[PDB]
Amino acid sequence: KPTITKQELYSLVAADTQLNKALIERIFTSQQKIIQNALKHNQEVIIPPGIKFTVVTVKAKPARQGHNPATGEPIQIKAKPEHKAVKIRALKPVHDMLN
Amino acid sequence: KPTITKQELYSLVAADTQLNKALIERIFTSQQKIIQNALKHNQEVIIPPGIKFTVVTVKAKPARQGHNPATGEPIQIKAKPEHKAVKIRALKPVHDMLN
């Protein structure tokens, strides 16, 4: 049994909720933007079925200096400066989802 | 800015969509029971806004003794048995949410 896509999820929800699949997708889009707007304001969000959205800070990687092993030619890497990233954490009900 | 509770999210979605909160809650309840039922059939599922749900077999890990790096306080870590676990991975839309 293969993976269940977002678009099949919408269909499965709509049939189980007995609601218009278009209204269903309106809901998740509203959630999607609320999650987005909060994170941008460094606000954390918990969504069903128990996932926590975090804003984490990523350390800067300095610019680096190397050589091609075969040809001895130099290669370089840009410095990737420190930035903000998004982490999700499975909460209590997601761990217990198999119980 | 404080964390938005799983319950506070419902209120915000209910206002943005102009749906009643109880209608919002029935949708996510249905989404939970579909995730839960598919994972218990070892089936993968993708949910908005871009999180993938996987069932993995986690190996047994023996108990170990850690240390608070700044004080040297010992901290024991209990042994985990061989268990099945729910793993969630963030996809591109979530990792791009701050962009």
How far away is chain B from the Cα of A74, in angstroms, using its nearest Cα?
32
Q: Which residues of B19-53 are buried (b: 16+ CB within 10 A; e: fewer)?
A: beeebbbbbbebbbebbbebbeeeeebbbbbbbeb
The boundaries of the domain holding residue A77 are 1-99
How far away is chain B from the Cα of A58, in angstroms, using its nearest Cα?
13
Tokens of B81: 């048995």
CB < 8 Å from B in window 58-97 of A: 84-88, 90, 94-95, 97
Interface A–B counts its CB contacts (< 8 A) at 141
Give chain A's domain count.
1
CB < 8 Å from B in window 14-53 of A: 16-17, 19, 23-24, 26-36, 38-53
How many whole angstroms separate alpha carbon B43 and alpha carbon A3?
Answer: 6
How many whole angstroms separate alpha carbon B22 and alpha carbon A96?
Answer: 24
Name the resolution in angstroms. 2.8
CATH code of the domain containing B31: 4.10.520.10
How many whole angstroms separate alpha carbon A13 and alpha carbon A15?
Answer: 5
How many whole angstroms separate alpha carbon A39 and alpha carbon A37?
Answer: 6
Tokens of A85: 């990233």
